[PDB]
């Protein structure tokens, strides 16, 4: 035979990206994975004859895997895979070598053994008989899902003896910075690091390495370091300056300030002010904690703080992490829900539409809304300022439905079908380490998909200080109205001093005493009456309104919130209480 299919993949996807402490590290990891995938794809496309199926290589952030329709003699086929594996390995090695040399620092020992064993490649051809696309694709995907079970790895060398990294816990620290504990010592290698060769610098000595590339006693592996010094990697696409988690929470305040002051903008975009500092000065503290340039850098930070305090621009310390993935993708791509003989065209159509949606998502999400860490195909992951979360969620869902689903309605086997996605957002304090936030976000996203066989639901959660969360699961639509719409309406009413939030605490206190162990109070009349009474009591009268119109607004407003419908469709009562509590919390963290 002469025609073959293809499927390329890189194994570590979730764990590798998760291992991060600063948003820059996460962005760098996603960028590295995308770059390797694009390198392999470009090598294949521009050398042999083939056409790509799943990811449009022209995109900006391709996923970890891709396919194609390659035609070659079977005898030579095995060679191509070896070529791709060698090319990817060489690219990884080159990026590491460039990263070390970029800072003109003598390379430590052990790098080549901690950067060339942390990735994997795999591929699985399959004969193609151009008569049943369904069978060939099903066979290929089954074989590809089975082949990955045989995980082969090479043992670490006997040289492994270290103190970890504070990011991983599975490798020898090959970098360090001398904290304030000791003024200066070579004993640090003797006792603290317990190792022979890990190049270090003194806390006072900052000439070879700038502040961005280490801090205090921060250990880093080979990979951890390669994943942070990529600014000098020499790849044009990389964006040199990426906002940090702390900066994202300041998106709104800066935007509000710019509308009132013009000259202040020059410093704002200069990236010459510590972002986390202004939070310290808010809590009545000194700047001695974080040594800085002091070339008027602290002066500029103090000026910004004084200006924002003067203009009365309140900002909060919480941010949000949101991610969403398409549901039931396997069935959709598998042709089980597509016309009998139109799968091959559907693949290309869906790939084009998903590329268009990815470009639209990239274009829409920008400051002060947030930043998109990576958005490609169905997947997505980004940060949102807490004052725009619901608008962003609704906009993304509506755009997906308008740009990917409705245009493809013709191909659907039954017109009643739909292609939707579930989402999950976790709020957290900026001080919290990012890895736990990411893992909790993944957990809530995977849970929200289990509401029912139809999926089409979203979850919101708050990561408390102790380390537990309270979540709420809801459908996207409740009788032709987005639930986030009702959440936004309640938040807007509470913030504008038109409805006090005493109808949430009172309801929590009243309805807790009747809830069973799991929580199901199945008497409708009592709960409906309680909701109506408490809501109608909670309203307030504005100074402009009279004593006659108030009785009209008080009745029209209660007909918009639709609390009864939320309760009917809430699949439980504690879920409804948690929904209200999260709405109140969000309304609090905003200006009101």
């Amino acid at each position: 035979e002469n025609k073959f299919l293809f499927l390329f993949t890189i194994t570590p996807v979730q764990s590798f990206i998760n291992q991060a402490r600063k948003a820059q590290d996460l962005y760098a990891g996603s960028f590295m994975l995308s770059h390797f995938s694009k390198a392999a794809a470009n090598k294949l496309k521009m050398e042999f004859d083939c056409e790509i199926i799943f990811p449009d290589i022209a995109n900006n952030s391709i996923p970890n895997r891709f396919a194609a329709v390659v035609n070659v003699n079977e005898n030579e086929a095995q060679a191509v895979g070896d070529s791709l594996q060698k090319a990817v390995e060489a690219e990884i090695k080159r990026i590491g070598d460039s990263v070390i040399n970029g800072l003109k620092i003598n390379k430590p020992n052990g790098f080549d053994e901690q950067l060339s064993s942390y990735f994997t490649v795999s591929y699985l051809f399959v004969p193609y008989n151009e008569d049943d696309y369904k069978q060939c694709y099903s066979e290929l995907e089954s074989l590809m899902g089975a082949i990955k079970s045989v995980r082969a790895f090479s043992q670490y060398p006997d040289s492994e003896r270290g103190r970890k990294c504070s990011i991983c816990g599975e490798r020898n620290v090959k970098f360090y910075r001398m904290a304030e504990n000791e003024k200066d010592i070579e004993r640090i290698k003797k006792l603290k690091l317990f190792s022979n060769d890990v190049y270090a610098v003194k806390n006072s000595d900052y000439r070879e390495l700038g502040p961005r590339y280490l801090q205090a006693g921060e250990g880093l592996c080979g990979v951890c370091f390669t994943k942070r010094g990529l600014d000098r990697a020499g790849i044009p696409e990389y964006k040199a300056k990426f906002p940090s988690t702390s900066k994202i929470a300041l998106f709104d305040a800066f935007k509000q300030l710019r509308e009132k002051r013009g000259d202040l903008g020059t410093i704002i975009d200069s990236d010459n002010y510590e972002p986390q500092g202004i939070f310290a000065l808010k809590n009545n503290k000194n700047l001695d904690d974080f040594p800085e340039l002091s070339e008027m850098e602290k002066k500029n930070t103090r000026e910004l703080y004084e200006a924002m305090e003067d203009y009365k621009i309140s900002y909060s310390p919480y941010y949000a992490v949101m991610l969403f993935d398409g549901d039931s993708m396997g069935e959709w791509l598998s042709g089980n829900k597509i016309k009998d003989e139109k799968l091959k065209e559907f693949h290309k159509e869906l790939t084009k539409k998903l590329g268009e949606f990815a470009n639209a998502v990239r274009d829409t999400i920008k400051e002060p809304l947030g930043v998109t860490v990576y958005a490609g195909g169905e997947d997505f992951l980004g940060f949102f300022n807490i004052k725009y979360l619901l608008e962003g969620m609704k906009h993304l869902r509506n755009k997906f439905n308008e740009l990917v689903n409705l245009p493809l309605k013709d191909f659907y086997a039954d017109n009643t079908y739909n292609m939707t996605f579930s989402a999950g957002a976790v709020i957290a304090h900026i001080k919290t380490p990012l890895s736990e936030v990411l893992n909790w976000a993944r957990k809530v996203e995977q849970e929200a998909k289990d509401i029912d066989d139809t999926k089409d639901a979203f979850a919101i959660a708050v990561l408390k200080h102790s380390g537990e969360i309270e979540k709420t699961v809801f459908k996207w639509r409740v009788n032709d109205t987005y639930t986030t719409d009702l959440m936004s309406k309640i938040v807007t009413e509470i913030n504008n001093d038109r409805l006090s939030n005493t109808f949430i605490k009172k309801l929590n206190q009243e309805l807790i005493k009747l809830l069973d162990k799991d929580g199901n109070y199945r008497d409708d009349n009592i709960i409906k009456a309680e909701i109506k009474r408490l809501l109608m009591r909670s309203f307030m009268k504005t100074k402009d309104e009279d004593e006659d119109a108030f009785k009209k607004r008080k009745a029209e407003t209660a007909k918009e919130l639709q609390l009864h419908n939320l309760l009917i469709h809430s699949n439980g009562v504690r879920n409804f209480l948690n929904f209200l509590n999260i709405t109140d919390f969000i309304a609090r963290q905003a200006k009101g």
């Binding site: 079977e74 089954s142 089975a146 045989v150 995980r151 082969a152 090479s154 670490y156 816990g169």
Partner: protein
């Protein structure tokens, strides 16, 4: 064979158990100052009166479905010459954190996989060659020989192992997947390994509890010779590690 019973989501690796068991011995014999006969032969984690075994990864899903071996017809970069594949096409999601039939798993080992229903807190250990006090609380009892009753056979892994090459017996040769582990010969035909674990001492990569190895009888061995040369016998690469209890394997 004094099987301890300690009291309080992951059963710690055998490395930690060795340190705790050794430390207790010295706390009561302070004069000893400046243990070599302590050898482990299995670690179990039961929160239920029956001891609980991990769910093998070769079985995939409320119920379990059994896999089968099939020489693939594809061109791939896999090291093994064969790969598991379900007999009938379906949605196959590998069970994660699954615990095999707490006692009925023996049917699983025996080949009776009728219905391996399993869930979607105290620790137990096996010791010998030392004496410790009769009483995280802990206790000490006695037992004679109790254990999981037993031209090719699988090889479960109930405790983490630390090989040399990393995922194959040091005897096994990468050239053709040929070698002899613990005298009894073999040849590699497939595998199913979970996400490796990382575990002063030098870090190492370990095969997780649940890995299944398939082999073929290399030569002419007495059924007793093989039947006893591997079952419940710690299989590892370094003899020192073997004592610590890395590689608890069944047949």
């Amino acid at each position: 064979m004094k099987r301890i019973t300690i009291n309080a989501i992951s059963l710690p690796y055998p490395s930690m158990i060795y340190g705790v068991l050794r430390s207790l011995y010295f706390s009561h014999n302070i004069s000893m100052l400046k243990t070599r006969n302590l050898k482990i032969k299995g670690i179990y984690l039961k929160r239920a009166s029956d001891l609980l075994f991990p769910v093998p990864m070769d079985c995939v899903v409320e119920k379990l479905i059994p896999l089968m071996p099939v020489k693939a017809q594809c061109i791939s970069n896999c090291k093994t010459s064969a790969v598991l594949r379900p007999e009938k096409g379906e949605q196959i999601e590998s069970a994660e954190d699954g615990w095999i039939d707490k006692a009925a798993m023996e049917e699983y080992l025996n080949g009776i996989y009728e219905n391996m229903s399993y869930s979607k807190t105290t620790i137990v250990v096996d010791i010998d060659g030392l004496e410790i006090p009769d009483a995280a609380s802990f206790k000490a009892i006695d037992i004679d020989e109790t254990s999981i009753l037993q031209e090719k056979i699988k090889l479960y892994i109930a405790t983490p192992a630390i090989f040399k090459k990393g995922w194959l017996p040091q005897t096994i040769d990468d050239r053709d997947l040929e070698g002899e582990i613990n005298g009894i010969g073999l040849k590699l035909i497939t595998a199913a390994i979970g996400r490796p674990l990382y575990v002063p001492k030098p870090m190492k990569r370990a095969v997780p509890a649940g890995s299944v190895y398939y082999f073929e009888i290399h030569g002419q061995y007495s059924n007793e010779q093989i039947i006893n040369a591997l079952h419940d016998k710690a299989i590892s690469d370094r003899e020192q590690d073997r004592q610590q209890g890395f590689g608890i394997a069944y047949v």
